[PDB]
Amino acid sequence: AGPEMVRGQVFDVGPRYTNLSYIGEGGMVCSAYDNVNKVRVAIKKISPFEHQTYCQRTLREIKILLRFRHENIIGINDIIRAPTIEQMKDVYIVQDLMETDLYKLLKTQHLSNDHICYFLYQILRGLKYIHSANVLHRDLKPSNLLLNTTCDLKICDFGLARVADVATRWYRAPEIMYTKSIDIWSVGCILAEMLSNRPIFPGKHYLDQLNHILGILGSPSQEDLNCIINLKARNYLLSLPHKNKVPWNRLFPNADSKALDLLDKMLTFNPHKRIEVEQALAHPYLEQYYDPSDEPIAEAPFKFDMELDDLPKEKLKELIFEETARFQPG
Ligand SMILES: CN(C)c1sc(C#N)c2c1-c1nc(Nc3cccc(O)c3)ncc1CC2
Numbered sequence: 419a420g421p422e423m424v425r426g427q428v429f430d431v432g433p434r435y436t437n438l439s440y441i442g443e444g445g446m447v448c449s450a451y452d453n454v455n456k457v458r459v460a461i462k463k464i465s466p467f468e469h470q471t472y473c474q475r476t477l478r479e480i481k482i483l484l485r486f487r488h489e490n491i492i493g494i495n496d497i498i499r500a501p502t503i504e505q506m507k508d509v510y511i512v513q514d515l516m517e518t519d520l521y522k523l524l525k526t527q528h529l530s531n532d533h534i535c536y537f538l539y540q541i542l543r544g545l546k547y548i549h550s551a552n553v554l555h556r557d558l559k560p561s562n563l564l565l566n567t568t569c570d571l572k573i574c575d576f577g578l579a580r581v582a583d584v585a586t587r588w589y590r591a592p593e594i595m596y597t598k599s600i601d602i603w604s605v606g607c608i609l610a611e612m613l614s615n616r617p618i619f620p621g622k623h624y625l626d627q628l629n630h631i632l633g634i635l636g637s638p639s640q641e642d643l644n645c646i647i648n649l650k651a652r653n654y655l656l657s658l659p660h661k662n663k664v665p666w667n668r669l670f671p672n673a674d675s676k677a678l679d680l681l682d683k684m685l686t687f688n689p690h691k692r693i694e695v696e697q698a699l700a701h702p703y704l705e706q707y708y709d710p711s712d713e714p715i716a717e718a719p720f721k722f723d724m725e726l727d728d729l730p731k732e733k734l735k736e737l738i739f740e741e742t743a744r745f746q747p748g
Pocket of ligand 1: 441442443444447460461462492513514515516517518519522561564574575576
């Protein structure tokens with residue numbers, strides 16, 4: 419029958435994966451029937467060989483998700499690519515099929531405080547495991563939080579993930595305009611969005627993003643501004659007129675006072691004064707779900723065998739070909 423196709427684009431995943439149907443982009447992402455495990459799966463087509471940045475982003479995700487094994491993190495079941503390096507133009511990552519994402523859910527559904535509390539717990543449960551491995555997600559947002567029929571949550575897209583030592587603007591920490599705290603900020607933005615079904619900081623650009631943050635948190639203090647900050651960004655925020663702090667209960671008068679207290683501690687301008695993943699799970703708002711016994715952590719910190727940023731384009735393609743060879747027949 420030949421290689422399969424979806425919306426005028428090759429999707430050569432057959433004969434194992436058949437009956438394809440489009441979902442979205444991230445390249446193209448489809449659902450497919452697996453003839454071996456007799457279930458429908460998710461398949462992400464990646465075409466990254468034009469740019470060295472897309473190759474290292476693809477390699478980092480594969481290496482991280484193959485090492486990671488946690489209920490609140492999407493794994494990798496299979497990887498399809500050409501039998502020879504010359505013909506390898508694409509990489510197909512096969513993962514578990516989820517019903518929806520948090521972006522599509524919040525666009526059509528109102529969440530009860532109980533559902534908000536359970537989603538937040540699972541995000542922080544999964545983040546606890548990520549952070550214990552000394553890994554930063556760097557792009558936590560509603561579209562990266564997959565959900566199943568029974569409301570179970572999984573974190574996906576580890577392309578922008580780096581080892582602890584570019585992102586979606588709305589959920590991007592002020593310090594970026596680096597460390598584990600940037601992911602807490604992003605979870606803060608996700609919590610605020612779950613409470614009102616709209617983004618708390620919808621900036622059109624980097625400047626508008628900062629103005630939206632200051633519009634709620636108020637003008638930053640001397641200690642907030644004092645850091646290894648961008649000279650242009652510092653002078654801009656100093657030139658801006660005074661902005662008053664909007665109390666959290668004024669933005670979400672409906673919301674649980676415990677949910678707001680946690681949101682305040684997560685949406686802290688200063689990343690050093692910001693709440694960490696453990697103290698966040700231990701917060702009185704999440705006591706119904708907090709269980710240190712059933713919250714696994716990584717065995718050892720994650721580390722790359724080599725500096726991927728220094729490797730030339732050709733060696734990077736060979737590494738992708740080598741890392742994916744384990745899923746080849748042989
Ligand atoms: C949102 N989306 C298309 C993306 S980007 C993406 C990445 N990285 C994934 C998925 C995905 N999605 C789904 N399911 C899903 C998501 C949205 C709508 C829908 O009907 C199903 N299951 C597994 C996955 C696998 C991982």
